Design a protein around this motif. Sequence first.
Motif, PDB file in Angstrom:
ATOM      1  N   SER A   1       0.795  -1.211   0.000  1.00  0.00           N
ATOM      2  CA  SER A   1       0.000   0.000   0.000  1.00  0.00           C
ATOM      3  C   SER A   1       0.838   1.277   0.000  1.00  0.00           C
ATOM      4  O   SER A   1       0.589   2.185  -0.795  1.00  0.00           O
ATOM      5  CB  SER A   1      -0.935  -0.011   1.189  1.00  0.00           C
ATOM      6  OG  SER A   1      -1.782  -1.146   1.105  1.00  0.00           O
ATOM      7  N   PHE A   2       1.834   1.361   0.878  1.00  0.00           N
ATOM      8  CA  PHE A   2       2.670   2.565   0.927  1.00  0.00           C
ATOM      9  C   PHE A   2       3.374   2.805  -0.402  1.00  0.00           C
ATOM     10  O   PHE A   2       3.401   3.923  -0.912  1.00  0.00           O
ATOM     11  CB  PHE A   2       3.713   2.482   2.050  1.00  0.00           C
ATOM     12  CG  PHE A   2       3.237   3.005   3.381  1.00  0.00           C
ATOM     13  CD1 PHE A   2       2.257   2.331   4.109  1.00  0.00           C
ATOM     14  CD2 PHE A   2       3.794   4.164   3.919  1.00  0.00           C
ATOM     15  CE1 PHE A   2       1.845   2.810   5.360  1.00  0.00           C
ATOM     16  CE2 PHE A   2       3.389   4.651   5.171  1.00  0.00           C
ATOM     17  CZ  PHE A   2       2.415   3.969   5.886  1.00  0.00           C
TER      18      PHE A   2
ATOM     19  N   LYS B   1       2.541   1.705  -3.392  1.00  0.00           N
ATOM     20  CA  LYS B   1       1.561   1.991  -4.428  1.00  0.00           C
ATOM     21  C   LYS B   1       1.106   3.442  -4.369  1.00  0.00           C
ATOM     22  O   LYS B   1       0.978   4.109  -5.398  1.00  0.00           O
ATOM     23  CB  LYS B   1       0.359   1.056  -4.278  1.00  0.00           C
ATOM     24  CG  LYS B   1      -0.643   1.148  -5.420  1.00  0.00           C
ATOM     25  CD  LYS B   1      -1.612  -0.026  -5.427  1.00  0.00           C
ATOM     26  CE  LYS B   1      -2.511   0.011  -6.659  1.00  0.00           C
ATOM     27  NZ  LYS B   1      -3.340  -1.224  -6.783  1.00  0.00           N
ATOM     28  N   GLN B   2       0.903   3.930  -3.149  1.00  0.00           N
ATOM     29  CA  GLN B   2       0.458   5.290  -2.925  1.00  0.00           C
ATOM     30  C   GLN B   2       1.604   6.273  -2.809  1.00  0.00           C
ATOM     31  O   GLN B   2       1.416   7.418  -2.402  1.00  0.00           O
ATOM     32  CB  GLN B   2      -0.469   5.330  -1.716  1.00  0.00           C
ATOM     33  CG  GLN B   2      -1.788   4.632  -2.009  1.00  0.00           C
ATOM     34  CD  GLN B   2      -2.549   4.251  -0.769  1.00  0.00           C
ATOM     35  OE1 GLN B   2      -2.767   5.077   0.118  1.00  0.00           O
ATOM     36  NE2 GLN B   2      -2.968   2.992  -0.697  1.00  0.00           N
ATOM     37  N   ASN B   3       2.779   5.823  -3.240  1.00  0.00           N
ATOM     38  CA  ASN B   3       4.007   6.620  -3.234  1.00  0.00           C
ATOM     39  C   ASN B   3       4.372   7.272  -1.902  1.00  0.00           C
ATOM     40  O   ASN B   3       4.801   8.428  -1.863  1.00  0.00           O
ATOM     41  CB  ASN B   3       3.964   7.677  -4.344  1.00  0.00           C
ATOM     42  CG  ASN B   3       3.808   7.065  -5.725  1.00  0.00           C
ATOM     43  OD1 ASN B   3       4.704   6.376  -6.219  1.00  0.00           O
ATOM     44  ND2 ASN B   3       2.662   7.311  -6.352  1.00  0.00           N
ATOM     45  N   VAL B   4       4.179   6.538  -0.812  1.00  0.00           N
ATOM     46  CA  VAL B   4       4.515   7.051   0.505  1.00  0.00           C
ATOM     47  C   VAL B   4       5.724   6.306   1.062  1.00  0.00           C
ATOM     48  O   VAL B   4       5.710   5.075   1.168  1.00  0.00           O
ATOM     49  CB  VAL B   4       3.343   6.902   1.477  1.00  0.00           C
ATOM     50  CG1 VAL B   4       3.725   7.447   2.852  1.00  0.00           C
ATOM     51  CG2 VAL B   4       2.126   7.618   0.916  1.00  0.00           C
ATOM     52  N   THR B   5       6.757   7.060   1.427  1.00  0.00           N
ATOM     53  CA  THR B   5       7.991   6.491   1.971  1.00  0.00           C
ATOM     54  C   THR B   5       7.785   5.452   3.071  1.00  0.00           C
ATOM     55  O   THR B   5       6.983   5.638   3.993  1.00  0.00           O
ATOM     56  CB  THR B   5       8.927   7.575   2.563  1.00  0.00           C
ATOM     57  OG1 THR B   5       9.170   8.606   1.596  1.00  0.00           O
ATOM     58  CG2 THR B   5      10.260   6.958   2.968  1.00  0.00           C
ATOM     59  N   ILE B   6       8.517   4.350   2.938  1.00  0.00           N
ATOM     60  CA  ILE B   6       8.500   3.273   3.915  1.00  0.00           C
ATOM     61  C   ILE B   6       9.675   2.308   3.666  1.00  0.00           C
ATOM     62  O   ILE B   6      10.208   2.240   2.556  1.00  0.00           O
ATOM     63  CB  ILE B   6       7.172   2.516   3.887  1.00  0.00           C
ATOM     64  CG1 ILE B   6       6.993   1.725   5.186  1.00  0.00           C
ATOM     65  CG2 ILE B   6       7.112   1.621   2.671  1.00  0.00           C
ATOM     66  CD1 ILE B   6       5.570   1.334   5.456  1.00  0.00           C
ATOM     67  N   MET B   7      10.130   1.633   4.715  1.00  0.00           N
ATOM     68  CA  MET B   7      11.225   0.677   4.595  1.00  0.00           C
ATOM     69  C   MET B   7      10.850  -0.600   5.324  1.00  0.00           C
ATOM     70  O   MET B   7      10.273  -0.538   6.416  1.00  0.00           O
ATOM     71  CB  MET B   7      12.526   1.244   5.175  1.00  0.00           C
ATOM     72  CG  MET B   7      13.748   0.336   4.931  1.00  0.00           C
ATOM     73  SD  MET B   7      15.327   1.036   5.482  1.00  0.00           S
ATOM     74  CE  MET B   7      15.788   2.126   4.081  1.00  0.00           C
ATOM     75  N   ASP B   8      11.107  -1.751   4.696  1.00  0.00           N
ATOM     76  CA  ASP B   8      10.809  -3.037   5.340  1.00  0.00           C
ATOM     77  C   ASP B   8      11.862  -3.233   6.438  1.00  0.00           C
ATOM     78  O   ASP B   8      12.937  -2.637   6.379  1.00  0.00           O
ATOM     79  CB  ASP B   8      10.893  -4.187   4.329  1.00  0.00           C
ATOM     80  CG  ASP B   8      12.308  -4.409   3.825  1.00  0.00           C
ATOM     81  OD1 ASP B   8      12.668  -3.787   2.814  1.00  0.00           O
ATOM     82  OD2 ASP B   8      13.069  -5.159   4.465  1.00  0.00           O
ATOM     83  N   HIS B   9      11.563  -4.104   7.398  1.00  0.00           N
ATOM     84  CA  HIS B   9      12.458  -4.363   8.518  1.00  0.00           C
ATOM     85  C   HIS B   9      13.812  -4.988   8.171  1.00  0.00           C
ATOM     86  O   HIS B   9      14.814  -4.707   8.842  1.00  0.00           O
ATOM     87  CB  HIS B   9      11.741  -5.172   9.596  1.00  0.00           C
ATOM     88  CG  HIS B   9      11.057  -6.396   9.080  1.00  0.00           C
ATOM     89  ND1 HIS B   9      10.201  -6.367   8.002  1.00  0.00           N
ATOM     90  CD2 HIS B   9      11.067  -7.676   9.519  1.00  0.00           C
ATOM     91  CE1 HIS B   9       9.708  -7.575   7.800  1.00  0.00           C
ATOM     92  NE2 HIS B   9      10.218  -8.388   8.707  1.00  0.00           N
ATOM     93  N   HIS B  10      13.863  -5.790   7.109  1.00  0.00           N
ATOM     94  CA  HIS B  10      15.121  -6.415   6.688  1.00  0.00           C
ATOM     95  C   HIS B  10      16.077  -5.358   6.176  1.00  0.00           C
ATOM     96  O   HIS B  10      17.211  -5.290   6.621  1.00  0.00           O
ATOM     97  CB  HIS B  10      14.905  -7.488   5.612  1.00  0.00           C
ATOM     98  CG  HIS B  10      13.949  -8.560   6.023  1.00  0.00           C
ATOM     99  ND1 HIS B  10      14.317  -9.629   6.811  1.00  0.00           N
ATOM    100  CD2 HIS B  10      12.621  -8.697   5.796  1.00  0.00           C
ATOM    101  CE1 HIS B  10      13.256 -10.377   7.054  1.00  0.00           C
ATOM    102  NE2 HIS B  10      12.215  -9.832   6.450  1.00  0.00           N
ATOM    103  N   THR B  11      15.611  -4.505   5.270  1.00  0.00           N
ATOM    104  CA  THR B  11      16.457  -3.442   4.730  1.00  0.00           C
ATOM    105  C   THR B  11      16.897  -2.482   5.851  1.00  0.00           C
ATOM    106  O   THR B  11      18.037  -2.007   5.859  1.00  0.00           O
ATOM    107  CB  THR B  11      15.705  -2.678   3.637  1.00  0.00           C
ATOM    108  OG1 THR B  11      15.258  -3.613   2.648  1.00  0.00           O
ATOM    109  CG2 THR B  11      16.594  -1.639   2.981  1.00  0.00           C
ATOM    110  N   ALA B  12      16.008  -2.255   6.822  1.00  0.00           N
ATOM    111  CA  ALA B  12      16.292  -1.363   7.949  1.00  0.00           C
ATOM    112  C   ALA B  12      17.416  -1.931   8.804  1.00  0.00           C
ATOM    113  O   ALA B  12      18.358  -1.211   9.160  1.00  0.00           O
ATOM    114  CB  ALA B  12      15.028  -1.140   8.802  1.00  0.00           C
TER     115      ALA B  12
END
Lengths: 416, 416
Positions: free
Chosen positions: A338-339, A341-352
């Motif tokens: 969702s984030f 798709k709606q172009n809202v910044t977010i990072m998954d926990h693995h990449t973090a």
Amino acid sequence: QYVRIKNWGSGEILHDTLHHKATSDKSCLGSIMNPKSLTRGPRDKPTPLEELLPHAIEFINQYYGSFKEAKIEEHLARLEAVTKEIETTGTYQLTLDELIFATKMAWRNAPRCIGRIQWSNLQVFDARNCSTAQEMFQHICRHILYATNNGNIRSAITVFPQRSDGKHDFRLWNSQLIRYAGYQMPDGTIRGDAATLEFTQLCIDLGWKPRYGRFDVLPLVLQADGQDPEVFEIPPDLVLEVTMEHPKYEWFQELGLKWYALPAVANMLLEVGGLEFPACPFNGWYMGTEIGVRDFCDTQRYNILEEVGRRMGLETHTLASLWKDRAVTEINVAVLHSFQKQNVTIMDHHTASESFMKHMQNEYRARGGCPADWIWLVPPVSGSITPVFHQEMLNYVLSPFYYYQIEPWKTHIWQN
Amino acid sequence: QYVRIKNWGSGEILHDTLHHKATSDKSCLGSIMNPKSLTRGPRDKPTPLEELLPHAIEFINQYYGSFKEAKIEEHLARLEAVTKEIETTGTYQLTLDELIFATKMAWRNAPRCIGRIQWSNLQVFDARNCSTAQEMFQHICRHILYATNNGNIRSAITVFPQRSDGKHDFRLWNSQLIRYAGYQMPDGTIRGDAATLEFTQLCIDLGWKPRYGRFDVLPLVLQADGQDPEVFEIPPDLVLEVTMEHPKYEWFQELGLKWYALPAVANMLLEVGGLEFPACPFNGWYMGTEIGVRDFCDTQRYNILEEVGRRMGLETHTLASLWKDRAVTEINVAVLHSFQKQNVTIMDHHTASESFMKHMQNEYRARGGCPADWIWLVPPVSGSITPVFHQEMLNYVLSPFYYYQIEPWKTHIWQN
Ligand code: HEM
Ligand code: HEM
Ligand SMILES: C[C@H](O)[C@H](O)[C@H]1CNc2nc(N)[nH]c(=O)c2N1
Ligand SMILES: C[C@H](O)[C@H](O)[C@H]1CNc2nc(N)[nH]c(=O)c2N1
Ligand SMILES: O=c1[nH]c2cc(Cl)ccc2o1
Ligand SMILES: O=c1[nH]c2cc(Cl)ccc2o1
């Protein structure tokens, strides 16, 4: 000499020497949520000069010592000027540059933050000249607007006037800038965010009109110059939200779930060179698991786990089936999908996690250490699947630092 | 008075008073694997009488104080008898009942164990009259056989002769009774359990014939009466294994994975009433995540995560896809499915967590506390999905207790 630290995943060894600059402070208080050691309470008298000056000098040295090409001349001048200001005023005002440096270092020194690789990337809003609640509200709105940036989230912090004598403290009663309300509905059932039950009521007790919905954005409860808190509704145009959709499960949107895009801590205190800032809201961007796991799956929050379970056709009555593990992952997938798709910044926990490991490596090379709270750095899911889990850490308080504060409504003396 | 403890999931509050009986002992050593505080090293001289007697009396009081219907008469007699034995022998021998009570209490006092609800259910094998390595081997085999019980796993412990002067220590060099070997293959690649690389070599250096396989059960390296360690191969008929199969993925068995059914700690030390037992192997049954998550998915272990990923047709090149979360769950499902199918005792992490929460509740009601190491009690996956995550805990060392020991090969003086 130095404390040895081992990463059982890569076998790498690190030498922590930074813990020597740690501050102060009955078994091992391992998993305590809000320990006093991490809390900086209220005052009713100014900071004793004998204490202030030493911390002030300590900080000024750190600030000037951070530059590559030293400025000995300016350093000495600042030292003298600060001392005089304290002698003649009983306190001192940080230069804009010093404050900026302080906010970033405090973030850099936040043991519980997994996003510290971004420590140097932070916008600072100087509101130390603020005087009224209405003014605080305007500053906060400007903050929210800048930080949201139409989905392209930007980390920022707004610094309000520092504590003087402790009787004129600027404070945000909210735990976060944007937060959903929790209602104790008539039919006994809890509605909205169960974690904000008490605070929601206080807002109602102050004149806020409850809308009894699942996602009602709570109003800002602002305390200016030690005076009584005023209620201000956040303009809806400023609150960006993301509707939850699953890439494969079309029935996911039927759940009617959504969440705000802006994670912003509002009730913490910034400590720097003996100075204390009781009001300094800050924000970054979300790490998927905060929404999908904590907000949506905690039993004390939205508790949507079982519902998503049935919808998936899982054996929700047999724990051993591991339906919970299966459900929570799809919710996490939904949040991330969702984030994006709606172009809202977010990072998954693995990449973090990896990002933090790189940061820690950078910190040890730069200053021989990195204060870290393992209990908070390890994601609420996929623990050992992340590298942070196998990394030994040392938790200690440095300076500058972001401390917790005692709930304002418990120490505030009402005017009327 | 008492330390307040909160469970953020249910909101329940608990009053810890048990921490007052805690023992002894530079920032906060939060995530340290093997801290000295949890380690009881070697000695070259007997326990000083001034220290022994106090601890001995303390224990005797605890033992007799555990009975519902007090035995004052016997209590006083035991107190006198123990004192005399120490006066005339410099130490004392526990009665079988006392030892049995000690092993269960030490388990009850293991802060890192999630299976403590079973604390009172433990078979004890008294081998305090043991004299030779061959005898130790026979005892260990009897243990393994009883504990395995054809898949219906039973918790047990074998107690070897207590430490005398520290020069005649009985010790098991193995970390666990059953463990797979790790080989540094010719083509550079690691084979088997990468975590046992060093220990595997030592076995080879002692005359053990390496079979260079993926699942080669390591031999028992036994040290009797302080003498040089002897190598003994464990009879294959005694090592029960489970072949890994997935309930839906038929290609899972093509991975050729399997694991032993008996988790047994072999290198720890039992401390009780001033007495120390350097050799006291014990076991319980497995909790699924230990095999599926730690053993199979840790990069420093079997590291099968990526392989299972491709086989599932996941985007193993995009972290944000959460393929790791999806893969690890199927592996956990496989482990649980295989054990159940092959009728071998096992418990999933969710059921284990709840079981511990019930235990902790029981412990606070019984003695006002339960020593717990949050970092170890929280499963390597589904952290916040389990109740243990939201439970505040107090970590402290009681007595009796199971301590870690320094690696024997680092302090042992070779005869020849
Ligand atoms: C850039 C993105 C950022 C990410 C992804 C990030 C992520 C996180 C996460 C996952 C936590 C745990 C929150 C919880 O469980 O309640 C946390 C805690 C924290 N973060 Fe960060 N953070 C970011 C930016 C910031 C910034 C800009 C600051 C400060 C200027 C900061 C200061 C802190 C502090 C003080 C805590 C502890 C809050 C508490 O204990 O309740 N973070 N952060
Ligand atoms: C009945 C089933 C049992 C289960 C399911 C269980 C499970 C566990 C688990 C999951 C751990 C973590 C292991 C690791 O991550 O390395 C652990 C640690 C531990 N358990 Fe239990 N346990 C059981 C029985 C026992 C028994 C019978 C004792 C003692 C008599 C015991 C003593 C301990 C100790 C001392 C530790 C710490 C080991 C270390 O720190 O390396 N457990 N247990
Ligand atoms: C009791 C326990 O300390 C508490 O539930 C924790 C632990 N770990 C956490 N980790 C993070 N990131 N955030 C949290 O709120 C918590 N809460
Ligand atoms: C560094 C960190 O303490 C270490 O990797 C941990 C943490 N939590 C753990 N938890 C359990 N149950 N077992 C472990 O081996 C570990 N290891
Ligand atoms: O996921 C997140 N992002 C965050 C940013 C701040 Cl400032 C605090 C907690 C957070 O959790
Ligand atoms: O899963 C498990 N079972 C266990 C039994 C003992 Cl004794 C130790 C660790 C364990 O981990």
